Amino acid sequence: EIRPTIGQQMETGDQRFGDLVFRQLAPNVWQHTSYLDMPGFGAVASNGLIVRDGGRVLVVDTAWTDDQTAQILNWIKQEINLPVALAVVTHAHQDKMGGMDALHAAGIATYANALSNQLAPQEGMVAAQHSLTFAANGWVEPATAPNFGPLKVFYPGPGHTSDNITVGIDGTDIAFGGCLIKDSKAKSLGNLGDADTEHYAASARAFGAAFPKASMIVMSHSAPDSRAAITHTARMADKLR
Amino acid sequence: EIRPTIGQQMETGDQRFGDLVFRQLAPNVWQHTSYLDMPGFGAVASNGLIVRDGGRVLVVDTAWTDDQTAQILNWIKQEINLPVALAVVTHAHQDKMGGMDALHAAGIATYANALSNQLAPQEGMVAAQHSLTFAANGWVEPATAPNFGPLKVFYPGPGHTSDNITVGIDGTDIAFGGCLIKDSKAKSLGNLGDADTEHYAASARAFGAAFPKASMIVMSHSAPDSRAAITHTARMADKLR
Ligand SMILES: C[C@@H]1CS[C@H]([C@H](NC(=O)[C@H]([NH3+])c2ccccc2)C(=O)O)N=C1C(=O)O
Ligand SMILES: C[C@@H]1CS[C@H]([C@H](NC(=O)[C@H]([NH3+])c2ccccc2)C(=O)O)N=C1C(=O)O
Ligand SMILES: [Zn+2]
Ligand SMILES: [Zn+2]
Numbered sequence A, B: 001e002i003r004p005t006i007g008q009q010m011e012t013g014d015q016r017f018g019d020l021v022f023r024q025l026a027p028n029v030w031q032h033t034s035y036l037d038m039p040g041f042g043a044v045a046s047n048g049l050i051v052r053d054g055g056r057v058l059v060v061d062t063a064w065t066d067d068q069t070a071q072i073l074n075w076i077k078q079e080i081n082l083p084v085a086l087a088v089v090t091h092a093h094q095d096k097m098g099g100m101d102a103l104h105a106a107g108i109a110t111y112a113n114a115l116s117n118q119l120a121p122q123e124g125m126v127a128a129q130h131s132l133t134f135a136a137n138g139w140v141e142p143a144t145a146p147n148f149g150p151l152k153v154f155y156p157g158p159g160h161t162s163d164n165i166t167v168g169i170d171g172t173d174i175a176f177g178g179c180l181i182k183d184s185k186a187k188s189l190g191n192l193g194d195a196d197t198e199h200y201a202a203s204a205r206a207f208g209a210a211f212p213k214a215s216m217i218v219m220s221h222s223a224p225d226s227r228a229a230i231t232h233t234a235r236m237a238d239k240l241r
């Protein structure tokens, strides 16, 4: 078993595949988990989503590396047996965008907040091929997100980073908060180095308000949690201002 | 204000002093907190203890670095102004033993598990001046812990590492679990790279049985917790075996 220093542990039903772990969250939704070995600290898990929509698949976030991301695509091709229509990445850091080149090499169209694409090169990340823009209330502008099917993209405001976005899965009770949301029992908000400490709490609550019925909250570095992940995250953030 | 990626956040009553934070836990006990800043990840907090016993100060664990540990010694001189009679470190890892040269520069007698001193070179730590040895029941051999006063040293068995030790403070309701014990809301056992997965659970419970009077459990990367820390640590460790 892989036992990360940060991240959920193996559970019955989890599928180990090379260095990756996949957990089915719904008939048409899987969490992909990849691991970064921090010397002297141990492994750090990062979680993203794989969504089946009819005859195709949609991906949220890359793995930490290109190699790991290639393995995710292999898994999709081999266990799900459907083509990836597109990927959305939720901000310009390694755990969410470190595997962009593997997507592009595989000929997959990629999308990110325009601001994520603007920051990407400053973060040593490859930008997505397309830019998402957002309305004043945070919802993605449809014209910039063609054929996203059930991926419902929402920009909650600056929080973990200025550019972080979130994704609800339509036709399910799942919403993905990426690195913005921490688990309901977290003692910290993780890396606040690029954080907007003034607006974090409002952006966390905005996410909750955007996906009001979502009962299963998926996040980057813990196992799927209740809505208490959103409200605890917001409480922790309240103590920043 | 320091907001660590890993570790408890600052609270009312905390004292900021240089790059460190100090927090009084009892009339004669303080917790020291130092931070290791990791590029692209943020700071990791590590906690140790400062004990005033009669007419001297006893230190448990160094800070991450020499410079940080020298700052602890300067805080002690300022706030308490009694000699530091000795320091004990709770195993041979950077967060617990990284600042040993600072203690030696200041002429302070240092103590560690013999095994910790033996491991120190491989771990890139400086070995303490003196080696503690233990009885088969885990209690320190008193002849190797001269002048420890209220510091009751217990080797609980292997867990976080082969060499981890723990310390109870006689006359207080405080015991120190170091990196062995995680808080009652912890999602993982932290870094398991050196851990004894078979024996961790029993070692955690042996710690609790060694210090039944300890109402306040102090640990390396969380704020002080109730005894539920011990229970919860043990039950997490149960899942490794
Ligand atoms: C602290 C965690 C894991 S670090 C990750 C992200 N950092 C990174 O992706 C960064 N390349 C990194 C550097 C060294 C070790 C691990 C990761 C960030 O800064 O937001 N986000 C985090 C988060 O809080 O969601
Ligand atoms: C995972 C945490 C923080 S890492 C710390 C200890 N590691 C260290 O002290 C190590 N020099 C280190 C490297 C990089 C970042 C932070 C620390 C260990 O391996 O046990 N113990 C830990 C613990 O579980 O108590
Ligand atoms: Zn990030
Ligand atoms: Zn992250």
Ligand SMILES: [Zn+2]
Pocket (backbone or CB within 6 Å): B091, B092, B093, B160, B161, B179
């Ligand atoms: Zn350690």
Ligand SMILES: [Zn+2]
Pocket (backbone or CB within 6 Å): B095, B179, B220, B221
């Ligand atoms: Zn530690």
